[PDB]
Design a protein around this ligand. Structure first.
Ligand code: CA
Ligand code: CA
Lengths: 175, 223, 175, 223
């Protein structure tokens, strides 16, 4: 169902830290950072190349003042232990040569540039897997009709970007 | 609730608690058969705990009644947090008394600057974690619509209104959702959302109950 | 028993918050911010116009792992509650038309750019007052031979800048 | 110490507490009459309290001996936090027992990976403040010189060295200054500086004692 739950079937703790790992039928590990472009520190959100690494623990937030993430709620996603050079730990989708890319910023980001994510259950069960949506403002109403995918770059980093296809799949493990 | 105080047992008789194993959302008793909480607080096994104070101990004046129905506003939009209101019909009628009493619905919307009482068993200190055993209270004035929209760029609809303090330190928080916001003995708001808790220029945003009076009187008379 | 001490004569808590008041209030009130030039928000460090205001509470920190700021240590100075648009709450000295000025940034600045301050006790027989030195790296040493001062601009704002005259006189009041 | 553990009464016999009406820095005993701490911890009239654990309560093993001469390093630079080493001579020779013992001077400059024990009564929270009554302990390894320079651009000199965890969460903090870094029975470093505490890619910087073995002995002989 459209309810958001972690690997063990538990709802997600609003503000709670999690590992964004792949399910067994995938390559790589958890979500990490990388230093691409002129970035002074790792500011690129990527999927770890190491099948063994849990990645970085991720802070998941919803504006709703509930203890859990409500269904269909947008969420802010950020590294609980961000690098020093990032103004805040929130992920943001920015324009770039590789298409819309998920990055950290050296500048404070208006809430509208971080409140841009939404999880989505993946129909079949056995594993509680979810895809990630990138949402945009049509002024009043917010729409989430675009997924986040993986785009391996020249240096091998599996960048998280808004891709036409090759959708990113996640299983959330409590940290 | 952050920057608040301990209300006092059964001092907020209309304050209910939604349980699904533990407490997850507040709620307001509007009559012995219905409760009003938030739309994002919808679950299908809600047990309503009435006449509560210490939600972790049985102090003896509680009432546990399941929900037979849970009706989310037909126009609720999770993506925009708009129309965040829900109606819950108790399986059996709640015994009304001094420890468990319903709260009145509004006839007219509230005016900015009006002082209200926001309560709940939410996080008491946001910039860390600490959740109260006993119920907490907070006196918060409605804030001007302009400063509300200015606080949350492109997010405020007419079904929303801010309240609290633009300096921070006193606001509601995670856990208070669905709870009550009473002004002059009237239920004006429902704890809904906000960016963080008690942050500067980040006041609590509440569902503007007054816009749903006809929908509520219409729902209670059909189910 | 070291040089840096507040109004009550106590050692300054490392990382603690203090009001930076002036010795002679005809100079202005405590320190705060203002939007000057093309700045998108209050990024200019000024002395408040209000002769009675305490200004903003200011964090004073030394990298030294001591409880109180050691005598002669460099310091970073920041607002305990900076304006949303700033990346970090720390002050920095950027180059300007009318000379090196104390400002906030929308970009997270590396440590070298904020570890540029140092207090100098003023010889007043009774009342603890300090001037403020600006320091910049040179030959593998950091030199502090330039004072901070106030430059009244057209729009009135009492700007803190690196001037050779009108040096700042400071009295620290624990917040 | 952040992310550490309670050492155990007198389990760190060489740990001393520099007192000024209250605890302000750590120190290390290298012989019945000499304590080595940091330069920035220099004060007038320092009182050295030996055999401590709970610095706020008297338990019976203490030994308070006032400083008779406090010699800070001749090339010490506060602007660069360089040569942050101080030598304190006591006016009365400490009585050596099992709870009050000297740590020997280093005979080598420990390489990266070497395991050490950092201790002190400093703050135990990276964010926030919380000062302990008892001495805290932290087992940490010396980090590569290159990891050190990358974390602190243009700040690391040959007289310093990083120890701890680049990922954060475990480190020394305010109130640990002048404190000891003992790696395998020898005094390798003194708690000096760092940026914040237990932060990511911001390890603790320690005075590299091995570079002062000569100074310490020119001093102790001529005093
Ligand atoms: Ca109870
Ligand atoms: Ca003691």
């Amino acid at each position: 169902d459209d309810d958001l739950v972690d690997a063990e079937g538990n709802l997600v703790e609003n503000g709670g830290t999690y590992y964004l790992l792949p399910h067994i039928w995938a390559h790589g590990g958890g979500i990490e950072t990388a230093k691409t472009g002129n970035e002074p520190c790792p500011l690129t959100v990527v999927r770890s190349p190491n099948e063994v690494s849990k990645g970085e623990p991720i802070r998941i937030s919803s504006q709703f003042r509930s203890l859990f993430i409500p269904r269909g709620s947008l969420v802010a996603l950020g590294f609980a232990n961000p690098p020093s050079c990032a103004a805040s730990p929130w992920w943001t989708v920015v324009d770039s040569p590789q298409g819309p890319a998920v990055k950290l910023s050296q500048q404070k980001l208006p809430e509208k540039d971080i409140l841009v994510f939404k999880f989505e259950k993946v129909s079949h069960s056995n594993i509680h897997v979810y895809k990630l949506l990138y949402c945009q403002h049509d002024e009043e109403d917010v729409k989430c009709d675009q997924y986040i995918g993986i785009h391996r770059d020249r240096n091998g980093n599996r960048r998280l970007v808004v891709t036409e296809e090759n959708p990113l799949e996640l299983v959330l493990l409590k940290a | 609730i952050v920057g608040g105080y301990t209300c006092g047992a059964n001092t907020v008789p209309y304050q209910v608690s939604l349980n699904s194993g533990y407490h997850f959302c507040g709620g307001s008793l509007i009559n012995s058969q219905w409760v009003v909480s938030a739309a994002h607080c919808y679950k299908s096994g809600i047990q309503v705990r009435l006449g509560e104070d210490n939600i972790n101990v049985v102090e003896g004046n509680e009432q546990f009644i399941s929900a037979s129905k849970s009706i989310v506003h037909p126009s609720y939009n999770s993506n925009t947090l708009n129309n965040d209101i829900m109606l819950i019909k108790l399986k059996s009628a709640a015994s009304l008394n001094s420890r468990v009493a319903s709260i009145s619905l509004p006839t007219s919307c509230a005016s900015a600057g009006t002082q209200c009482l926001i309560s709940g068993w939410g996080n008491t200190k946001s910039s860390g974690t600490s959740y109260p055993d006993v119920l907490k209270c907070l006196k918060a004035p409605i804030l001007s619509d302009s400063s509300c929209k200015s606080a949350y760029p492109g997010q405020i609809t007419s079904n929303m209104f801010c309240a609290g303090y633009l300096e921070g330190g006193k606001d509601s928080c995670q856990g208070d959702s669905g709870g009550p916001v009473v002004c002059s003995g009237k239920l004006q708001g429902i704890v809904s959302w906000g960016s963080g808790c008690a942050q500067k220029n980040k006041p609590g945003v509440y569902t503007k109950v007054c816009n749903y009076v006809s929908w509520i009187k219409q729902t209670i008379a059909s189910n």
